[PDB]
From a paper:
The p85α protein serves as a regulatory protein for both p110α and [name]. The p85α protein contains 5 domains, an SH3 (Src Homology 3) domain capable of binding proline-rich sequences, a BH (break-point cluster region homology) domain, an N-terminal SH2 (Src Homology 2) domain (nSH2), an inter-SH2 domain (iSH2) and a C-terminal SH2 domain (cSH2). The p85α protein can dimerize and these dimers associate with [name], protecting it from ubiquitination and proteasomal degradation to stabilize [name] levels.
A unique feature we noticed in the bovine p85α BH domain structure that was not described in the previous paper, was clear electron density for two sulfate ions near residues K224, R228, H234, W237, and Q241. The residues involved in coordinating the pair of sulfate ions within the bovine p85α BH domain are conserved in the human protein and they adopt similar positions within the structure, suggesting it may also contain a novel binding site. We generated, crystalized and determined the structure of the p85α-BH-[name] protein (2.4 Å), containing a mutation in a potential sulfate binding site residue. No other major structural differences were observed. This result is consistent with R228 contributing to sulfate binding. We recognize that sulfate binding to Arg is very common in proteins crystallized from ammonium or lithium sulfate solutions, but the distance between the two sulfate positions (7.1 Å) is similar to that of the two PO4 groups (6.8 Å) in inositol 1,3,4,5-tetrakisphosphate, raising the intriguing possibility that this surface may recognize phospholipid head groups. The docking model predicts that p85α-R228 makes contacts with peptide backbone main-chains C250 and D252 within the [name] C2 domain. Several of the p85α BH domain residues that can bind a pair of sulfate ions are also involved in mediating interactions with [name], suggesting that if phosphorylated lipids bind to the p85α BH domain at this location, binding of lipid and [name] would be mutually exclusive.
Numbering used by the authors:
A (entry chain B): 113 to 167, 172 to 276, 279 to 297
B (entry chain A): 113 to 167, 172 to 298
The structure:
Amino acid sequence: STLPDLAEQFAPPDVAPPLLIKLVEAIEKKGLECSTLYRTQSSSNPAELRQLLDCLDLEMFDVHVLADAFKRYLLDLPNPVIPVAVSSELISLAPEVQSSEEYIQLLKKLIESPSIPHQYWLTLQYLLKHFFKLSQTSSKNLLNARVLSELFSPLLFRFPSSENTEHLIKIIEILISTE
Amino acid sequence: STLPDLAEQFAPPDVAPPLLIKLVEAIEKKGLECSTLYRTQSSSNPAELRQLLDCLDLEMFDVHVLADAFKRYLLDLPNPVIPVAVSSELISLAPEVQSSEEYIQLLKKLIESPSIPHQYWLTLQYLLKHFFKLSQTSSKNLLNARVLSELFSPLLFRFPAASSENTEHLIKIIEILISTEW
């Protein structure tokens, strides 16, 4: 697993990692209306998917393989899209905080910290925009913000169930809806 | 006071921050043989030097202003080229770690940590290449690797520490890394 850090894959003024852009654009070209997108088991194994995340046009691949490589990419980032410091803070507040708007404002403040490269928040925004675009054909693909949040929150936060973890999933659900 | 983190200023396959490349190339074009390069102050103050670290072609500036803006850049980085995580570990090493080679081996392992983006080590290497190129016209500019390490180690590490046999060891590895570039 040689996937570089998000901060090593691109820098401002680019808006997202180029590999993630290739994946997302190919998936939206081929899979926007697919009623099992991102919910189907992997026909390929991790080693083969990793091969794909090095090398040529991603439209040539089966869309269910692209969706798996997308998941593989989020799992192989050496640090997750939402860093563990951020997750740890949000989780340790949950008995005491319940306001979703407060968690959301705090997620933005934590992830835009000077100690965290801006690439992390830029990537999260690119992901949220993808997830939101999927949710606009949810009558066909069955992916609304809530389902997208249950699928991807564990890959974004990198967590394997309290009222806490539920609060993280709800944050992502609201963040997808309000784009 | 602005200046983004090294890891936001560029990314692989670029080898260094674009602003730092402009500074180093202009300084080497105009000052390679200058016998007081980096050892004299210019008239400009930090606010004026920071002003320069935004806007023209840097070859237009006085070479002593460029040299001061270089120092200003290393000082205004939100984290130093060699992060405090790395310095804290290197300073904690025992006298039984007598070995310059071991200090260097530990610097490389710690700075290439997954917690530290590759941009930090890449910038350090770009700087070492500059310093090495300076030490090769030492017969004219009077700079050897050891003096370049005494001048720039406090800017690369940015570390308040009493002058110990540890800090002597940090100055020493920078000295060695400058010489062993080519």
